[PDB]
Amino acid sequence: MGPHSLRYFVTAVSRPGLGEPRFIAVGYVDDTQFVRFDSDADNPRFEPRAPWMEQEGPEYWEEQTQRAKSDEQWFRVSLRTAQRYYNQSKGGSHTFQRMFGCDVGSDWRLLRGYHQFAYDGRDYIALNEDLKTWTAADTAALITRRKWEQAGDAEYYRAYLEGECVEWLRRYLELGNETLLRTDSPKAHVTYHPRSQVDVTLRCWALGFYPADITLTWQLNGEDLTQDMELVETRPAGDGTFQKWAAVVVPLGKEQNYTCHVHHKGLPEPLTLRWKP
């Protein structure tokens, strides 16, 4: 079944005077976290955060640990440089973030490689989707852009994104196939909430599903349009699955005319649900 992604989300936060920056890296395959590194652990190592990763041997962990430690110093240095670029005080804490990885189609073609940075919550510099040129968000990032074009770093990153990023994603999907290539279908039900003599709320719940992509609709008899349905953002259950709900306000006594429709990869067809007195 379909596309996949390998992503790393790396955060470095300076702590001037309180010593070295906080450096945290987390890796995800699709909607599932699988590794971390945190500089503040008493013995900072790259570590598994999904049980299927315990299949990788000690050489993998040692190598990855070393890579994290090299970037820890990269960010130490780059944080000090950005402080100077922006003429900021030496004492304040600032944040650099970096996101990199690959999105692949089901035949493993690269749909998009990423290698991208933010500073203090705004875009700083990003490898463009051509994997050859750079987009600077401001004039401080223009100085970085020039240094990276001079260094030819784009080609180093492209070679990773087109090659190794994809090869390792494949490996992880194989190591974690029982969970990463599974679906868990939503368990769904409708709840009924009295309010006034004219109105009630019906809430359509979907629980325990993987992956996170889901769509809930409400229909009145035929369908639904120009609609004021309340929705929450899809949220983690904490056990590797997700939750979502969608609610409508309807006239008292007309509840049986409304149907909830749940759409998810794990179902053999959309699920239709009603309020069941």
């Binding site: 990855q64 994290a68 240095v77 440089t81 990199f100 510099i125 240094k147 990276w148 260094a151 190794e164």
Partner: peptide
């Protein structure tokens, strides 16, 4: 596979 950054900022 974590990929280290090259040139600094």
């Amino acid at each position: 596979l974590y990929l280290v950054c090259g040139e600094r900022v």
